[PDB]
Design a protein around this ligand. Structure first.
Ligand code: 149
Ligand code: 149
Ligand code: MG
Ligand code: MG
Ligand code: MG
Ligand code: MG
Ligand code: MG
Ligand code: NA
Ligand code: NA
Ligand code: NA
Ligand code: NA
Ligand code: NA
Ligand code: NA
Lengths: 1011, 204, 193
């Protein structure tokens, strides 16, 4: 029958979808959500054998264990155990596009388990098996007898095993197919794996059972009154003595309870549902649920007889909240939301796509700690525990159907075909039937990148009909089709339009006011965080805050999809597309997270945290104005700390408790501060500290901060005259300067400071030269597909122009002796194919104090692509343990991504001055730096810099971080100017004009001296 | 043009149509109809079927047609004749002046139906003036109303021809049979004959 | 697999639906809507045999005409030929309401046709068969090989027979089931045939 090559057959003998069940036979256990003796886990060690195709599977496998099989842990993806390679491809399908057919060589995983089943489970009731996640299709056998079939790798497939089991030992046989017609709806840009990767368990339900229940909460205008409505469905024989009681609990207090026999109201000419009943409970002054304060109640649904005999009980957490779009705004409990979200795949570097509670909790804590209040389930229903945690910790969730057909041409070829409507409908309907009771889910998504087809409109309407409590959204076909209540573009820019034909990405500010448009706009994806990214992030938030209908978005994305591999020594290293022999592959494009695979933050995380702060500030005179962006809570766990420092040196500080109501403001008058003595710039730095611990953070947690330049006193004091006068030694080949035991050597041939001595120890391994290039960032490379060679990308334009090939040609090199110093004047031209790209003119002034004043004036030909940077670089002969600097920090920060950094005195070990991006590139830069200290060296001025054991050349030529080797000495890059890193997307030039070095003529000065 | 979907015998009527497990089977009866007949100028209105109550599957298929073929209005009578699955109020046997306030699915008099708060759609009875036997009394009342009220745009009489079958007696002469004459049981007897003309097309 | 008791399976190997085709190889004929040589009718005399259930159908029938069968005209409702009785019920289903199951005693009509096909049709192109109406479900065989399945009594079911036909004589075998899960969607107030 080859059911795995037929979109008409998405399952066989599969039970109906429903909300989480546990079949408690005790109500208190249901109330407290404790383990149920009726819900057994079958996770653990299973038997496993791998086959090249389903036709290679021996019939004997159905009757008994294959000796050739191994014992492995379940859940798991078999690629993670080494049976075959995991494949990383973005758009292009991992298989030949020929729906509904899949390759004849179809990796087949045969799972089997021998287990016991208590006789008590078979003497009465129904025993079913539950597979929470099987990728991508499978056949089931119990004791050699065929049971059923199932598709959709992201939702549970349940089967009745009542007639298949026997008291004692039993054996299951599961044939998991890697590829199936379902694979055509699962073309998400992620690793392609397979197997039983989610839980497997047995559930025993009585014959007369609760087969489904829906919980709805409606409110009056001011939310002071609520009605909890619970519809309950049952299966089995209807009896007049049967009853359903629904009780609502607030902690250990019972708030309300209602009982009633079965039999619903009249529906149509034929009657009503005799097997259903709806309980309505009144609730006064309900504690409302929100991401801010996740208030929760517990609803227990008991099925019982009139004489008080419990048959079974189910239950769920209930969050009282209303979600609705009104007059163009997405409102929660009547307040307009501002979505600080992020897309999040279920990925683990060792276990692949298998999710565990610990990793989930770790992600949520890190998310809330970094000011995120929402998550999009890109691009499929998640492990059932995710929703429970988001309900309890408080995060708004966009639950998304497992449907992506990106590799089709056009994208909507399948979604506009009615023959695929059935398969698509199940991926949407079974998601809703499963997650509809979770308060954390506030929006339904029809899928991702499947263009826009008629099948979308049908399913959109289906949701709106069965569940009017949640808005529905979908980005395909232009982000504003008739299948979405929300304009949800991906990578649409703030001010710049991208007028693509048919599916244009208008700037978000413009999109809102297009003739006739009235819907709110929330980007489903934005600020692509691939590698050194998030440049321009602050631009989005300034817009989100200014425009009511711009209600945020979800950053792409949370965690790098890198996998752990081990070298000969057994040392682990991070791998990406193509490191498993997988091909075609899209290499490093699977890594776009704010955090590394092991959850260590990327520098970009701090920028997001800062921009997504819930408190805003304005300074006026001595008054700090604090505005709360919380919609429901007062600042009852916040105190503001302020600090004033003169160039890093603390002068005054203090703290005032914060007491601002949601959306309110507070004025904090700073005490009179004694004006500083010495010259310099005074800086005010405020930060919000939460004194008390919470479910998501520790005491002392910093949730927000901001800085302001205060008074500055320019230095007018003339330095005391020097004691000695530097001496100039002119030779045919050099210009050497002597002063004490210090020496400076300038090569008259190259025209660069080739060497500098302190005593007799050389300070440089490589001369000090200009540098106008950088090891390309993921954004500079600009490709989402390894097969695309984009000429328009920055790196390609830089190479073509010869920036990476340019060579300095000495135009001038003279030396003069001044009354108290030596002046070396030079001029260089950088050319490529007879074209002068850059002209750099410098002057070096070394005086009696041993300080070398370097002035650099650069010319950049207007018709050459704007350079990555304008500065100098050299390889210092020495290596120190610390790096001290007065500037923006402490973390890596670039021109278009430095709002989170603070000007102050920072001191870190050399290693922290290097960011371990899996795919090496320019990194570790720090801007607004006025002083840099390293070893015995000190550089002063107004520059940007990075310092590490890796030259731009090595980073540029090494594809993986684990292959980098520390070079002798220390590489120093000091830039007068540096181009933005961009990030609006990573497959087209994204550096905003204001951050491009297009001025033509640049000037910067650096003083180099001994410390 | 009407999809082959009628689940009248269910309790309640929408038991299958509000069940997503039956959405596939239902979608094929609607989608394959549209793909076959969309080029015929005679077809001016699509129908989602008959007497299947009103379920979510109806709303889904209703929108599917509106999306693939905007040139024709879509109508459906199940669930009250005025649900979100129909562009036309299309009751069956709703009377001209007399209301029939059935619970949940009332059949208002057609003149009153048009003006209910918020109602704006045209009204065309998908079925009316049941011509079973000596019938059609009051027919003229409908037409006086159709002519006076702009939004009352007619209807479809039920129905065209008796569903009687030919049987033969001892002499071998033909006679007109109805429910139960073939030993079929249970059966609803003469209720299959509601036409304006006899089975042989002779006028009533 | 009892495909007639599974609303999840409404057809097997059925071609996409589409507007009326005639495949003219002459435009003038297409303009005047004249008969097309590429569209052959298979209406006429067929071989038919009635069975109380699909389980009673002998395997021999798949590759050889049953001698007990009669020659009947098609299209036709078998109740009209007297094989069993037509049923008239208004609202109440003629079968026990227990979706998606139907009675085990499911009147089965076995149709077969021996017909010719010219090599010119098989040497090039696609040859498909079209059933404009089959009540209410059926399995199709061609020269003893299973071809497909179909439901919905009021729309055409088309199947590609290009790989099952041969030059010369060919034999179709169609097993039509009176009841199927599709019957649950066909409870119109009319005779049940
Ligand atoms: O548009 C997109 O951009 C991302 C690029 O990393 C990723 O492929 C998402 O799944 C896709 O929706
Ligand atoms: O409401 C109806 O009335 C008629 C009674 O003869 C017939 O049963 C139609 O099919 C049905 O829609
Ligand atoms: Mg399939
Ligand atoms: Mg994609
Ligand atoms: Mg700032
Ligand atoms: Mg079927
Ligand atoms: Mg009826
Ligand atoms: Na806004
Ligand atoms: Na990606
Ligand atoms: Na406080
Ligand atoms: Na690199
Ligand atoms: Na009128
Ligand atoms: Na009738």
């Amino acid at each position: 029958r080859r059911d795995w090559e037929n979109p008409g057959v998405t399952q066989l003998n599969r039970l109906a979808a429903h909300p989480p069940f546990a079949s408690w036979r005790n109500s208190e256990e249901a109330r407290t959500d404790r383990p149920s003796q009726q819900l057994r886990s079958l996770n653990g060690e299973w038997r496993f054998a791998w086959f090249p195709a389903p036709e290679a599977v021996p019939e004997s496998w159905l009757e008994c264990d294959l000796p050739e099989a191994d014992t492995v842990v379940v859940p798991s993806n078999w690629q993670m155990h080494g049976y075959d390679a995991p494949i990383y491809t973005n758009v292009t399908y991992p298989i030949t596009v020929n729906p509904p057919f899949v390759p004849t060589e179809n990796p087949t995983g045969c799972y089997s388990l021998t287990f016991n089943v208590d006789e008590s489970w078979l003497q009465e009731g129904q025993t079913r098996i539950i597979f929470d996640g099987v990728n991508s299709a499978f056949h089931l056998w119990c004791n050699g007898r065929w049971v059923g079939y199932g598709q959709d790798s992201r939702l549970p497939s349940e089967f009745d095993l009542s007639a298949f089991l026997r008291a004692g030992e039993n054996r299951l046989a599961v044939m998991v197919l890697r590829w199936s017609d379902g694979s055509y709806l699962e073309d998400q840009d992620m690793w392609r794996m397979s197997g039983i990767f989610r839980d497997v368990s047995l559930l025993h339900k009585p014959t007369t059972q609760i087969s489904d229940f829906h919980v709805a909460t409606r409110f009056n205008d001011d939310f002071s009154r609520a009605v909890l409505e619970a519809e309950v469905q049952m299966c089995g024989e209807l009896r007049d003595y049967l009853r359903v009681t629904v009780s609502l609990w607030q902690g250990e207090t019972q708030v309300a309870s209602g009982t009633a026999p079965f039999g619903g109201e009249i529906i149509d000419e034929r009657g009503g549902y005799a097997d259903r009943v709806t309980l309505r409970l009144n609730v006064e002054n309900p504690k409302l649920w929100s991401a801010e304060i996740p208030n929760l109640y517990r609803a227990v649904v008991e099925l019982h007889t009139a004489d008080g005999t419990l048959i079974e009980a189910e239950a769920c957490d209930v969050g009282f909240r209303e979600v609705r779009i009104e007059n163009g705004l997405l409102l929660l409990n009547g307040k307009p939301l501002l979505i600080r979200g992020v897309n999040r795949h279920e990925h683990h570097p060792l276990h692949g796509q298998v999710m565990d509670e610990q990793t989930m909790v770790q992600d949520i804590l890190l998310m809330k700690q970094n000011n995120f209040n929402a998550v999009r389930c890109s691009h499929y229903p998640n492990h059932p525990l995710w929703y429970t945690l988001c309900d309890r910790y408080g995060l708004y969730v966009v639950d998304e159907a497992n449907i992506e057909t990106h590799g089709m041409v056009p994208m909507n070829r399948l979604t506009d075909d009615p023959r695929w409507l059935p398969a698509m409908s199940e991926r949407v309907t079974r998601m809703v039937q499963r997650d509809r009771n979770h308060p954390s889910v506030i929006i339904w998504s029809l899928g991702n990148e499947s263009g826009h087809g008629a099948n979308h409109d049908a399913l959109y309407r289906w949701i709106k009909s069965v569940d009017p409590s949640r808005p529905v959204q979908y980005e395909g076909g232009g982000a504003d089709t008739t299948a979405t209540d929300i304009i949800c573009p991906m990578y649409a820019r703030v001010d710049e339009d991208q007028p693509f034909p048919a599916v244009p990405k208008w700037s978000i500010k413009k999109w809102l006011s297009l003739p006739g448009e009235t819907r709110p706009l929330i980007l489903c994806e934005y600020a692509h965080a691939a590698g050194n990214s998030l440049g321009g992030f602050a631009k989005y938030w300034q817009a989100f805050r200014q425009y009511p209908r711009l209600q945020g978005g979800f950053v792409w994305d949370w965690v790098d999809q890198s996998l752990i591999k081990y070298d000969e020594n057994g040392n682990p290293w991070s791998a990406y597309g193509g490191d498993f022999g997988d091909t075609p592959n899209d290499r490093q494009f699977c890594m776009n997270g704010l955090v590394f695979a092991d959850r260590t933050p990327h520098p970009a995380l701090t920028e997001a945290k800062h921009q997504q702060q819930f408190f805003q500030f304005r300074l006026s005179g001595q008054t700090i104005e604090v505005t709360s962006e919380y919609l429901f809570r007062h600042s009852d766990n916040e105190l503001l700390h302020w600090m004033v420092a003169l160039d890093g040196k603390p002068l005054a500080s203090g703290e005032v408790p914060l007491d601002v109501a949601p959306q309110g403001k507070q004025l904090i008058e700073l005490p009179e501060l004694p004006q500083p003595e010495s010259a310099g710039q005074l800086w005010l730095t405020v930060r919000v500290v939460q004194p008390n611990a919470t479910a998501w953070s520790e005491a002392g947690h910093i949730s927000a901060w901001q800085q302001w330049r205060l008074a500055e006193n320019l230095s007018v004091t003339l330095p005391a005259a020097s004691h000695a006068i530097p001496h100039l030694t002119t030779s045919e080949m050099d210009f050497c300067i002597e002063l004490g035991n210090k020496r400076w050597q300038f090569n008259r041939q190259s025209g660069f400071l080739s060497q500098m001595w302190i005593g007799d120890k050389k300070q440089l391994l490589t001369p000090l030269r200009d540098q106008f290039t950088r090891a390309p960032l993921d954004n500079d490379i600009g490709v989402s597909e390894a097969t695309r060679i984009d000429p328009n990308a920055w790196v390609e334009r830089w190479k073509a122009a010869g920036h990476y090939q340019a060579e300095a040609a000495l135009l001038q090199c003279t030396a003069d002796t001044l009354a108290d110093a030596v002046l070396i004047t030079t001029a260089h031209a950088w050319q490529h194919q007879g074209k002068t790209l850059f002209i750099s003119r410098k002057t070096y002034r070394i005086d009696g104090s041993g300080q070398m004043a370097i002035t650099v004036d650069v010319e950049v030909a207007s018709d050459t692509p704007h350079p990555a940077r304008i500065g100098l670089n050299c390889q210092l002969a020495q290596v120190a343990e610390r790096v001290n600097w007065l500037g923006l920090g402490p973390q890596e920060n670039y021109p278009d991504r430095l709002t989170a950094a603070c000007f102050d005195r920072w001191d870190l070990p050399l290693s922290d001055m290097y960011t371990p991006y899996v795919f090496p590139s320019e990194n570790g830069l720090r801007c607004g730096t006025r002083e840099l200290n390293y070893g015995p060296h000190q550089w002063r001025g107004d520059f940007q810099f990075n310092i590490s054991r890796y030259s731009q050349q090595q980073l540029m030529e090494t594809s993986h971080r684990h292959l980098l080797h520390a070079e002798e000495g220390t590489w120093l890059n000091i830039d007068g100017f540096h181009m933005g890193i961009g990030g609006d997307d990573s497959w087209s030039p994204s550096v905003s004009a204001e951050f491009q070095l297009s001025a033509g003529r640049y000037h910067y000065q650096l003083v180099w001296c001994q410390k």
